[PDB]
Amino acid sequence: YLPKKVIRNYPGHPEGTTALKFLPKTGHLILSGGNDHTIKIWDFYECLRDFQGHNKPIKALRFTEDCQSFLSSSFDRSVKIWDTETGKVKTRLHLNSTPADVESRPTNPHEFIVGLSNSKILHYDDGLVQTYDHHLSSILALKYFPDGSKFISSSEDKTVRIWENQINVPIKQISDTAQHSMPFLNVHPSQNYFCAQSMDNRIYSFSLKPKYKRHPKKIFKGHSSAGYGISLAFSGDGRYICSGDSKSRLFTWDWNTSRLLNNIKIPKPITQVDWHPQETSKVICSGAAGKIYVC
Amino acid sequence: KEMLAEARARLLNTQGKKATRKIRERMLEESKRIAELQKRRELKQAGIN
Amino acid sequence: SWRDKSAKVQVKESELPSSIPAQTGLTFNIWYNKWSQGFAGNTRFVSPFALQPQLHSGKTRGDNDGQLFFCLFFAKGMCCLGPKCEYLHHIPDEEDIGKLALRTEVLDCFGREKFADYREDMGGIGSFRKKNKTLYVGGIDGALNSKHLKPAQIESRIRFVFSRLGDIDRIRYVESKNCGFVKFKYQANAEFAKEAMSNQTLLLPSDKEWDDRREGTGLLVKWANEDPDPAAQKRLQEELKLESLNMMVHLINNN
Amino acid sequence: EPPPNICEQCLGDEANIRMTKIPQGSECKICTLPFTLYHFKTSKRSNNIIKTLICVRCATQRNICQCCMLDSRWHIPIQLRDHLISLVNEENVMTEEAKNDMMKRFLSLKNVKLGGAQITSDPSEADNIVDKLKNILLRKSFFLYNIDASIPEWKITDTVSQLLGILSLIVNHKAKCGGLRFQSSELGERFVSKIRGVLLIDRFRIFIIPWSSGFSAASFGTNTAENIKLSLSLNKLIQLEL
Amino acid sequence: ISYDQLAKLSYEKTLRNLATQTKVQKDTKTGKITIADDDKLVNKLAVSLQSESKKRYEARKRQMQNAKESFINDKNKQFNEKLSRESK
RNA sequence: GAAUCUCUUUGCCUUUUGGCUUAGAUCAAGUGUAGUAUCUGUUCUUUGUAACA
RNA sequence: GUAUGUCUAAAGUUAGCUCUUAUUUACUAACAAACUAG
C-alpha cells in the first residue's frame, strides 16, 4: 500500500548515507554507507555495529541471497565483502578504477560481479574469473535475472547489455538516439519487467523477453532525477514504484496508468529508496542528509 | 500497410544523416555533461573537492 | 660560512647522466630530444643529485665577475665546473636578493624569463604579475616511496629541508590533501627552492629504503595559488597594504 | 616605428649606452606579438644582458617600461600602483590581464591605456594623485606563546638573532605556537641573559618558555583539528595570565 | 504603415502609458555630466519596460499557441501559413 | 464621464525553405545466421473517557 | 575495408482495452559458401 506519512526518525550519519538496501525476504536489517564514516545497520529502533576498513564514501551495498555477507562498493578502489554476523575479511579487491555497484549471483556465494568505472566488469569467485568489456563509458549500475543465470549492465552510455553467466558477449545491447543513460535499475519482483531510471527525469520499463522491445505508456515522467544517483524501488509482489528525486521529494507510482500518487515533502536530494519485503505499506528513504526517514 | 508505413517513414526523413549524427552527438554531449555533473555532485556531498 | 671558501665540484663531467632521456618510446626524436611512438611509463623520475648547501657552497667566478644570478645546477646539485661557473653557487641571502631588486620581477634569480601567467600545471618559472612566494609541495607519495608516515613527521621533514634554502615565512602541510605550502621571506628564495627540491626525495639516509632511493617519482614543487581561506586573504591584504604604505612613503620622498 | 620605453633605472648610471635593435625580435611576454627588441648591457663590461621583454604598445597600455616592467613615472609594480590608485580614488582600478591568446592580441592592439596607466601618464594628474597620497599619509629548546598568524617565522628568527650577536626554529601557525632550537650550551645562557619573559617584535608580545622537552612538530599537534583547539585553549591560558 | 509612422505611434502609445501613470552638474577636468535622476522614476521606467516586454512576451506566446494546411514539422506549418498569407 | 481585462479584424514574420554543375551521377541478380523496426495471427485482464510525565 | 572522429589519474592547491507468443515483410553486416573502397 501507499506510503503517506514520514513516520520514524532513524538518525544515521551526519554525512550522506549514500547506500540503503534490505536483506531479501527478511526485513530485519538495513545498510547505510555515509561519506566519511563507515557502514551502520538499523533494525526493527536499534543499532548493531560499524564496519571499519573504509576511507572514502560508498556507492552501493548489495547483499547475497545467502544473506550472511554483503558487498561494499566504496570510492576508494577497494571492494570488501563483509559478514553481517561477525564482519570479517573474505576478500579485499584492490582495483584499478573506482568501482560501481558490486553485486552477487543468487545461486552461488562464489559468483560475484564487480562493476568498475574504467568501462569494465570483473566476475569473481572465492580472484579474477572473467572480464567484461563492451561498454564504452563508465559503468553505472547492474542487476540480474530471476534466480540469476544471466546479468544486466548499464553505463554512462545509454546502452544496457544483458550478459550471461560468465559470457562476455551481450545477447541484447539496448540503445536508441534519444536515451540519456540508465544510471540505476531494479528488477520488478514478478521478474518479467525491467525498470530503469534515465536522466530525462523518467523511469523506463522494458520487458525480459527474447523480443525484448519496450512497452509504451509505462513511463514515469514527473520527476527531477537529472544529476543524482537515485535508486528505484518495488513493493511486495509489484503493486507500486517508489523513487526519490532532487526536490527533497519521494514519488510513488501505479502500473496500469502510471500516474502520480503521493508527492511527499520529506526534509537535499532524496536518492536511496527501499521497500520492505515484510511490511506491505512502508518505505525507507534517505537523501544526502543522513536522517533515514521511513514512509 | 507495409508500403504505406515505409512511405510515411520516408516523408519524415527531413534532416540529413550528418544532421542526424549531429543531433546524436549533441545528445551525447548533454548526457556526458549531466553524468559529469552527477559524479561531481556525489563527490561534493562526499567532500572530495 | 660560505663567503670564506670556494665552491666545490659537485659532479664530474663524466659523472653526469646523458641528456638522452629514459626510453619511453621506440625511436629518439633528435629535434625535440624526446621519445615518440608510445606513451607508457613516466618521463618523470627521482633526481639523482641533491643540493647539500653547507658542504658545496662557496665563492665562484660569479663573485669575481660581479654577476648576481644564481646557478640552476647548484640548486639541482649537478654542476661540473664548481668554482668556475659563471653563476652563484650559494644560498640566496638578503644582500644578494637586495642586489636582485632591479630585475627579480622580470627575470627570476636564475636568469630565466618570467612569463605572462602560470601554466595549467602551475609549475615552471613564474609570473611577473604575482609577487609569488608560496610553493605548493605535492608528490609526497613517491617522495616517501609510498611509506606510511604520520603527517607531523612529514611536516618536520619538509620544514627541515626547506630551512636549508633561505628564510621561511610559513609552512603548512595539508593532512587531508597530502601537500605543503611553503611561503618564503623573498621571492628569490622561493624560486631557488623550487629549483632546489625539484624531484628529489624526503627520504633520510637513516631509513632502510636509502638504496632504493631513486625508484619512484620524487617531489612536486610548484608555484601555489592564493590561500582561499578568508583569514589568509585578510593577512595578505593587510601585509600588501602595509607594503603599499611603505611605497607611499617612497613615492612622496621621490616627488 | 615608436622608440621604446626604457626608464632611467634599467639603463643605469651611464650617459653613453649602446643598445642592439633586432627587428621582429621575439614575442612579447604579454600579448605574444613580435616586435623590435632592444638588448643592451648596463655598463660596457656588465655580465648581465638586459633586453626589452614587452612590445611598445603593451608598454604604453600599462605606462610601464619595457625592461624592468615597472611604471615609467614611478618605477613601481603594476599591481601595487593599481592598489594605490584604488586607495586614492576609492575606485578599484585594476589591470585587466588577459589569459586567452586571441584575447591577448586583441587587448594589445586597441588604442587605450588600460589599468592605472592614464593617471600616471600625464604629470599633472600624477602630481595630483601624489599630493592626494600626502593627504592620505596625513590621515636547549624553547617554546613560544601568543604568535598571531601575521607573525612569520623569519621575523622570529631575526629578532632573536638581533638581540643576540650573530639556531633553527619551528612554528606551527595553525596552532599559533612557536619553538626554538640550537646546540650550544652557552647560547641558551646568553638567551636567558638577554631577556616567562616577553619578545617584542613589532609591539606584538610573544611569551617565552624554557622547554626542557625535545619538541618536534608533533609536540605542537599531530593534526589540524588539534591545532585550532590548542590555539583556543592557549589563548584562554593567556587570558589566565592576564 | 512605415517605420517612421510606427515609431511615431509607439511614442504616442508610450505617452498614453505615462498619462495612465501620471539638475545638471559638470566637473572641471573630466567634463562628465552628472544628472540627478530620481530613484522612483528610474525603477518606474525599469518596471514599465519589463512590463512592456512581458506583455509583448505573453501576446507573442498567444500567437505561438494557435494551431488549426499540409505540413511535416512545426517550421513547415509556419511556412505553409506564410504561403497561405501570400495567396491573398 | 476617466480608465483596466477579454475577444474580433487589419499591419508587421515572429523557430518563416541560407550556393553551384552533367535534373551533379547511377539504381537489388539471390541464400543462411544475426540485429533493428513494423504489421498480422494467438492468450490473459476490465473517535470519546480516565491516569501518569 | 578505409578516410576520419571520439574515450583513457603518474602528479591530490591550503576553509474498445493491458498482455504472452508465432508467422510475414522492410533496412543493415569485410558474418560464410584470400581478393575488392570514397
Ligand SMILES: [Mg+2]
Ligand atoms: Mg572521395
Ligand SMILES: [Zn+2]
Ligand atoms: Zn654552477
Ligand SMILES: [Zn+2]
Ligand atoms: Zn605585447
Ligand SMILES: [Zn+2]
Ligand atoms: Zn625599467
